[PDB]
Input
Amino acid sequence: GSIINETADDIVYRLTVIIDDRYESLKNLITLRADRLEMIINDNVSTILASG
Amino acid sequence: GSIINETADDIVYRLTVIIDDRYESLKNLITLRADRLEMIINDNVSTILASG
Amino acid sequence: INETADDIVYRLTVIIDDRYESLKNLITLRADRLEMIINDNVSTILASG
Amino acid sequence: GSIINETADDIVYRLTVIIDDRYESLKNLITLRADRLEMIINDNVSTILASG
Output
């Protein structure tokens, strides 16, 4: 494409990579922490039920 | 010509779509995990109460 | 062209900030709600034995 | 090395700084709230188990 069109594509591409990376990191963190809370709750409920 | 102004608008437009899409995805994920945890907590508490 | 770069950065910063504040509010409100739900349910359990 | 390339690099760099800053803030907030939830769940479960 033209110089200006390619520059625009370059800017959008590079920032999309940055945005996607940070997004994936936050998604993974939210998933990890939520998953752990569910694991903890599951284990704790089992322990409580086994105690009364 | 006006191509520089138009290209700037296109860059902003394209990245806005990306930014918004990732935002919605995180918003939905956070909401989903929050809802899941609330239901899990409420269900488990009922089970515990039904046992004493 | 330099003012164009500033315009792009400014406009996108405004949108980035808007979505950022929305997520911050969501996270805070949902976490607050979960803490309340957890404590309320625990109180019920403690009051039941 | 050109004016157009330096401009693209400039735009990408400046927005990356912004994106990174907001990312770190959200990361820290999620971590903080998740840590609090684990502590509150841990505290309450220990209390329940110690009460019956």
Chain B touches chain C through 23 residues (CB under 8 Å). The domain at 1-52 of chain B is CATH 1.20.5.1060 (Single alpha-helices involved in coiled-coils or other helix-helix interfaces). Residues 10 and 16 of chain B are 10 Å apart (CA to CA).
